[PDB]
């Protein structure tokens, strides 16, 4: 039958629940699962010092510092520094136990728990791959993969070579197909709707997933996917996300490829590892008992092992489209980067920030430099992060001779490069403003992306644009006002008005000249620019200027005209690889000695400050 070979499960198998559980729980060779678990454990062991930030844990979770934090849950406070150098060692032990196999369930739990404790602790450190590693660890906890090529096999008589159910491979393949197919779909929806190499990746996503499943296509599919994933390294700073998929692909091959690979390619010894004759029947595998009397009755380890696949794959498919349920996290474009399998927005051009505060006792105004406390910049363009920042400042300022201060932000984003628009309302007090994950926020100003004839003049002017100038479009809301002191280098500055009316004011001659729909006004340099909007509709400006003195100074340069990358490129790959190995050894050893110091502390007594300083200096010491 065509269904018999293509789509290996027979069509009549999908007839009842009791047939489905039998279909999912059927014996299969565990050879591939062992290799995948080994490589995943190896990679998770390797990346912990570098990417998860064990080398730079002292500089981030210091003691005696005052820093605002951005946790997913506001009650999930971090542990002290010397009780946080230990959870990473617990995580490392769990990952090593994953890799080898010793106490596989315990090692899986010991790696799972701290990873999801330190992942839901900084919303500014969520990537697309960290979520994937967490999901893979969560899957591998429940699926037994020590049945072949494991140390735990040599200390037991039931895991040397056994039969795993099929739903392990089913869940792994389904999860990776979802990863390959959801990203491709999101690449389509985003690109041509909000509006080469772009189409190549999209077609690769969808075609690679689909063809990699269906039988004859594996060789070409493996070639193409492997080429793409190997080339994506040294082109994106994604980390080890490429290597996880380069090792997640040979799980779409027949589940016996290691056994067929060892056979040929002759050798002198193939008997040190257990000789591959045949697996052994397992306990958790529904077998075809004699139909004369009755069939096997599956237990809880089969029915639950079948229902978990469905209840997990459906939820995984539903989650990346759960945007409409979490609305408070939704800024203009990207709400809670992470569980989306799509790329972020590159912070547009955030520019000017004007945090100001008023004291609740003396009623005095004060200015704060942007980002005085925090360690990240992502708190700026987010409604869920700005509230946390304001609340942290409200908590901490009363220790600086203030009391219940009221804070106002003025964030002038640039959506692409020429649409300066107030993303956050100046007039609202962020500390006492209501906020909820589901209910829509009230102080985020609605987008005015086009909302104007700004996409016509945009071109109608470039034909008439002279030499070295600059034109900026600014959209303003009703009931607010603006200010921008102009320098002493921009000449012929002028404003053209598109929607509504403006009340341009100069503080020097004290002029309050209003404008109607269409009026050219020449404004001087080095003066105030108090522009007010009185119309109920948002306005639009045509701020145009030319550096008239730039032509004068560039003529002087033209008058005179009439009057270690190379070293690193010439050098071959040997010394570059040597430098890579040296820096990796340095970071690994720094992590190891710092962890050893923190482990000695709070286990024994803490020694004197002199020894602490000496050993800290010793750890910093760069080798050669
Ligand atoms: C005499 C006193 C000062 C002892 C100090 C010795 C340190 C310099 C040693 C102790 C622990 C060593 C580390 C122990 C374990 C590893 C794991 C090892 O991991 C691998 O990546 C090797 C396997 C692979 O290539 O995948 C790399 C070397 C490293 C960082 C070692 C580097 C050198 C360290 C820090
Ligand atoms: C120029 O005219 C504008 C009116 O558009 C004045 O703006 C007003 O300023 C007062 C100050 O207390 C506010 O109460 C009003 O609400 C503002 N009106 C608007 C429409 O925003 C501005 O003060 C004038 N300039 C000077 C120097 O007096
Ligand atoms: C040590 C403390 C913080 C306990 C941490 C354990 C809890 C918070 C962690 C452990 C494993 C985690 C789960 C791992 C995988 C998934 C699947 C994903 O699609 C939704 C979130 C969800 C369901 C996680 C929710 C949080 C979770 C349950
Ligand atoms: C104030 O903040 C700015 C931007 O975050 C920073 O560059 C500057 O160093 C801060 N001021 C001081 C005194 O550090
Ligand atoms: C200023 O320069 C612009 C350049 O496009 C020109 O159109 C305008 O006439 C100039 N104005 C004055 C007053 O020189």
Q: Are 198 and 183 in contact (CB under 8 A)?
A: no
Residue 326 inside a domain? The answer is: no
Q: Are 6 and 215 in contact (CB under 8 A)?
A: yes
Joined tokens for residue 281: 């029947």
Cα 389 to Cα 70: distance, rounded to the nearest angstrom: 8
Those residues whose C-beta lies under 8 Å from the C-beta of residue 594, and which sit 6 or more positions away, are 55, 57, 58, 85, 619
Residue 218 inside a domain? The answer is: yes
* Domain final residue pick, 447, 469, 490: 447
**Is 187 an active-site residue?**
yes
Question: Which ligand minimizes its atom distance to the CA of 376?
Answer: 4
Q: How far is CA 600 from the centre of its chain?
A: 35
Residues 140 and 191 in one domain: yes
For a mutational test of ligand 2's pocket, the pick from 532, 536, 539, i.e. the residue with the most ligand atoms closer than 8 A to its C-beta, is: 532
Å from CA of 109 to ligand 3 middle: 12
What are the CA-CA distances from residue 441 to residues 115, 347, 356, 444 (Å)? 31, 21, 21, 6
Total domain count for the chain? 4
In this structure, which residue's CA is closest to atom 4 in ligand 5? 466
Residues 463 and 375 in one domain: no
User: Partners of 566 in the beta sheet?
Assistant: none
The percent of the chain in helix, strand and coil, each rounded to the nearest 5, is: 45, 10, 50
For a mutational test of ligand 1's pocket, the pick from 45, 588, 596, 614, i.e. the residue with the most ligand atoms closer than 8 A to its C-beta, is: 588
Residue 134 inside a domain? The answer is: yes
Across 298-428, where does the E strand assignment appear?
356-358, 365-367, 406-408, 412-413, 419-422
Residues 364 and 467 in one domain: no
Q: Which residue has tokens 């050098």? A: 571
Q: Which structural domain, as residue segments, surrounds residue 499? A: 454-562
* 469-474 vs 419-422, strand pairing mode: parallel
Joined tokens for residue 145: 């993969």
Å from CA of 434 to ligand 3 middle: 28
Q: Which residue has tokens 């602790």? A: 121
Residues 159 and 129 in one domain: yes
What are the CA-CA distances from residue 573 to residues 217, 228, 577 (Å)? 35, 22, 6
> CA angle, corner 253, sides to 247 and 259, nearest 5?
90
Is the distance from the beta carbon of residue 461 to the nearest atom of ligand 3 less than 6 Å? Answer: no
Resolution (angstroms) stands at: 3.5
Residues 45 and 186 in one domain: yes
* Domain final residue pick, 562, 587, 608: 562
Q: Which atom of ligand 2 is nearest to the CA of 512?
A: 1
Residues 367 and 464 in one domain: no
The residue among 319, 245, 282 whose CA lies nearest residue 145 is 282
Residue 340 inside a domain? The answer is: no
Taking residue 170's Cβ as centre, other Cβ atoms within 10 Å add up to 18
Residue 493, domain CATH? 2.60.120.10
Residues 41 and 123 in one domain: yes
Across 319-405, where does the E strand assignment appear?
356-358, 365-367
Plot region of 207 (φ>0 → left; ψ -120 to 50 → alpha; else → beta): alpha
Burial class (CB in 10 A: 0-12, 13-18, 19+), 183: buried
Residues 313 and 353 in one domain: no
* DSSP H or E segment with residue 471: strand 469-474
Taking residue 410's Cβ as centre, other Cβ atoms within 10 Å add up to 17
Residue 289 inside a domain? The answer is: no
Residues 421 and 546 in one domain: no
Cα 410 to Cα 539: distance, rounded to the nearest angstrom: 18
Residues 194 and 233 in one domain: yes
Residue 341 inside a domain? The answer is: no
Cα 487 to Cα 542: distance, rounded to the nearest angstrom: 18
Determination method here?
cryo-EM
Cα 460 to Cα 511: distance, rounded to the nearest angstrom: 31
Those residues whose C-beta lies under 8 Å from the C-beta of residue 268, and which sit 6 or more positions away, are none
Those residues whose C-beta lies under 8 Å from the C-beta of residue 568, and which sit 6 or more positions away, are 576
Residue 272 inside a domain? The answer is: no
Choosing from 123, 186, 187, 387, which is the catalytic residue? 187
Q: Are 206 and 181 in contact (CB under 8 A)?
A: yes
Residue 61 inside a domain? The answer is: yes
Residues 118 and 172 in one domain: yes
SS3 of residue 533 by DSSP: strand
* Domain final residue pick, 562, 580, 610: 562
Residues 383 and 419 in one domain: yes
Those residues whose C-beta lies under 8 Å from the C-beta of residue 461, and which sit 6 or more positions away, are 471
Plot region of 347 (φ>0 → left; ψ -120 to 50 → alpha; else → beta): left
């Amino acid at each position: 039958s065509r269904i018999g070979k293509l789509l290996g499960f027979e069509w009549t198998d999908l007839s009842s629940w009791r047939r489905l559980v039998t279909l999912l729980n059927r014996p299969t060779d565990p050879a591939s699962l062992a290799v995948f678990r080994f490589l995943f454990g190896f990679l998770m062991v390797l990346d912990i010092p570098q990417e998860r930030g064990l080398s730079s844990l002292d500089r981030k979770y210091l003691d005696g510092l005052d820093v605002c934090r951005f946790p997913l849950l506001d009650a999930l406070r971090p542990l002290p520094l010397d009780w946080m150098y230990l959870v990473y060692t617990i995580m490392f032990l769990g990952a090593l136990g994953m890799m080898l196999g010793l106490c596989y369930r315990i090692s899986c739990v010991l790696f799972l728990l701290p990873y999801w404790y330190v992942f839901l602790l900084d919303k500014t450190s969520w990537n697309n791959h960290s979520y994937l590693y967490g999901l893979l660890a969560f899957q591998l906890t429940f699926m037994d993969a020590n049945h072949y090529w494991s140390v735990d096999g040599l200390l037991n008589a039931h895991r040397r070579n056994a039969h795993v159910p099929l739903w392990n491979y089913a869940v792994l393949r389904g999860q990776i197909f979802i990863v390959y197919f959801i990203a491709g779909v999101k690449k389509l929806d985003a690109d041509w709707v909000e509006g080469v190499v772009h189409w190549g990746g999209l077609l690769l996503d969808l075609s690679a997933g689909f063809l990699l499943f269906f039988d004859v296509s594996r060789s070409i599919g493996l070639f193409f996917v492997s080429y793409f994933h190997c080339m994506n390294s040294q082109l994106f700073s994604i980390g080890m996300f490429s290597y996880v998929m380069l090792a997640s692909s040979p799980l779409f091959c027949s589940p016996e490829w290691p056994r067929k690979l060892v056979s040929y390619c002759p050798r002198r010894l193939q008997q040190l590892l257990p000789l591959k004759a045949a697996p052994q029947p397992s306990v958790s595998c529904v077998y075809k008992r004699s139909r004369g009397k009755s069939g096997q009755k599956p237990g809880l380890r089969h029915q639950l092992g079948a229902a978990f696949t469905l209840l997990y794959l459906l939820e995984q498919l539903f989650l990346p489209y759960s945007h409409f349920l979490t609305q408070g996290y939704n800024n203009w474009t990207n709400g809670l980067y992470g569980y989306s399998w799509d790329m972020m927005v590159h912070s547009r051009s955030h520019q000017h920030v004007k945090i100001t505060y008023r004291d609740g006792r003396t009623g005095e105004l004060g200015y704060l430099n942007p980002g005085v406390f925090t360690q990240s910049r992502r708190w700026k363009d987010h409604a869920d992060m700005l509230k946390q920042y304001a609340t942290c400042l409200s908590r901490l300022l009363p220790k600086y001779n203030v009391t219940e201060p009221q804070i106002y932000f003025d964030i002038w984003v640039s959506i692409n490069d020429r649409f300066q628009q107030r993303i956050f309302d100046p007039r609202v007090d962020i500390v006492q403003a209501a906020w909820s994950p589901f209910q829509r926020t009230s102080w985020v100003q609605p987008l005015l992306m086009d909302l104007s004839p700004w996409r016509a003049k945009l071109q109608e002017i470039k034909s008439s644009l002279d030499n070295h100038t600059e034109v900026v479009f600014i959209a303003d809301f009703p009931g607010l006002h603006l200010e921008n002191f102009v320098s002493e280098d921009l000449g012929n500055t002028s404003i053209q008005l598109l929607q509504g009316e403006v009340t341009v004011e100069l503080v020097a001659e004290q002029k309050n000249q209003t404008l109607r729909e269409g009026e050219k006004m020449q404004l001087p340099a080095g003066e105030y620019h108090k522009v007010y909007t009185t119309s109920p509709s948002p306005s639009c400006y045509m701020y145009v200027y030319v550096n008239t003195t730039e032509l004068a100074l560039e003529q002087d340069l033209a008058y005179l005209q009439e009057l270690e990358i190379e070293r690193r490129r010439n050098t071959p790959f040997h010394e570059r690889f040597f430098r890579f190995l040296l820096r990796k050894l340095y970071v690994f050893r720094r992590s190891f000695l710092m962890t050893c110091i923190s482990l000695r502390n709070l286990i024994l007594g803490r020694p004197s400050l002199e020894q602490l300083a000496q050993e800290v200096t010793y750890a910093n010491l760069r080798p050669f």
